[PDB]
Design a protein around this ligand. Structure first.
Ligand SMILES: *SCCNC(=O)COc1ccc(Cl)cc1Cl
Ligand SMILES: *SCCNC(=O)COc1ccc(Cl)cc1Cl
Lengths: 208, 209
């Protein structure tokens, strides 16, 4: 058909990495409001039907273990998988507590072969990366991956994602939502905008 | 605003620029891209049929591709709904091959920005790239842009794009079209790559009226 088959026991797992406080050795500031963000996101995504678990002030190897363990889990009764990252981010890279980890390394574990159970099922990656002290990136290319990447109450992106999903999460296809989100943050405005990278093969709805 | 789809009530759909690079200077060390004419032709027929004003350029230098698009960006687009541009060439990272060399795909698209192309503000700017290989990039982040970058070596992507676009071009939304595209090039392989769609679009895009 033209939609991802959503007929499974559970929707799927949803990991939230919520890096707020950073090790002195990175000169990275307190991301105030990431707590308002992560709460909003937990409530919103749990409402969709995800098995949300939040992890805070994660080290780089924590972030990598979290995700490798997740990939290693049996996902036969899951309709899909979803990771959300809140942090400082530069290019191809997220900040953990104790330094920087490359984004693509977190998703690698979920590839075609490496996660046979999650094959032909959407892997959803929501990234909200901050700048700021106080050059290139490679998006990995695999079927059934989606990224919603952003740069900046909590963040305008996070706020919008929840508001729309809370409201149309059950009746709109993933792309329509993210578009409405893209639109919403644009309205606020130098000028920045989230982007959606889609390697999806079908339409994604969070119901039926 | 309040509708969730781009206003398409204009005199015309807009321009569609195809750049069809088949032959390259021996110095570049790139081969003849056999089957790219079949792509150029299918695409032009396809996008013509949608209602775009198609122009087809062939075997371009880097300076041509650069000048070409700058002059396109300097036109008056007030009576158009959108703008499409299709690049068929050799391409590595953030770079597309002209016939004599290699320009950054970014500088080509730079010209169509709100800042420097005021007549295409809040109108979708569509880049379909079919870059053959023969390593990191940097995607420009501006509202109402959309990229459809395929890497897979008529081209499987190009053929699929046209076939879906001819049959559903006036009833589906681009994200639907291109999702369906991803799916077939992906199906050509339970014997792997796949095209990726980068969207900065702010509304739904229907090519109809
Ligand atoms: S969508 C264009 C914006 N992209 C970035 O700034 C960096 O994005 C990414 C980097 C690595 C990975 Cl695995 C995915 C993405 Cl979207
Ligand atoms: S969609 C991620 C994979 N795309 C690529 O291989 C290269 O992507 C790009 C490079 C430059 C520009 Cl302007 C746009 C894109 Cl999508």
């Amino acid at each position: 058909t033209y939609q991802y088959n959503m007929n499974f026991e559970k929707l799927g797992k949803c990991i939230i990495i919520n890096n707020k406080n950073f090790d002195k050795v990175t000169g990275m500031g307190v991301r105030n409001g990431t707590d308002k963000d992560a709460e909003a996101l937990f409530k919103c995504f749990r409402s969709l039907g995800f098995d949300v678990i939040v992890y805070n002030d994660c080290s780089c190897a924590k972030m990598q273990d979290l995700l490798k363990k997740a990939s290693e889990e049996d996902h036969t009764n899951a309709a899909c998988f979803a990771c959300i990252l809140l942090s400082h981010g530069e290019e191809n890279v997220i900040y953990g507590k104790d330094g920087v980890t490359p984004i693509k390394d977190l998703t690698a574990h979920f590839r075609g072969a490496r996660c046979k159970t999650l094959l032909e099922k959407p892997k959803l990656f929501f990234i909200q990366a901050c700048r700021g002290t106080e050059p290139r990136y490679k998006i990995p290319v695999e079927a059934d991956f989606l990224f919603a990447y952003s740069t900046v109450r909590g963040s305008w992106f996070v706020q919008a994602l929840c508001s729309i999903l809370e409201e149309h999460g059950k009746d709109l296809e993933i792309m329509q939502i993210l578009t409405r989100v893209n639109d919403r943050v644009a309205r606020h405005f130098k000028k920045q905008i989230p982007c959606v990278v889609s390697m999806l093969t079908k339409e994604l709805y969070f119901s039926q």
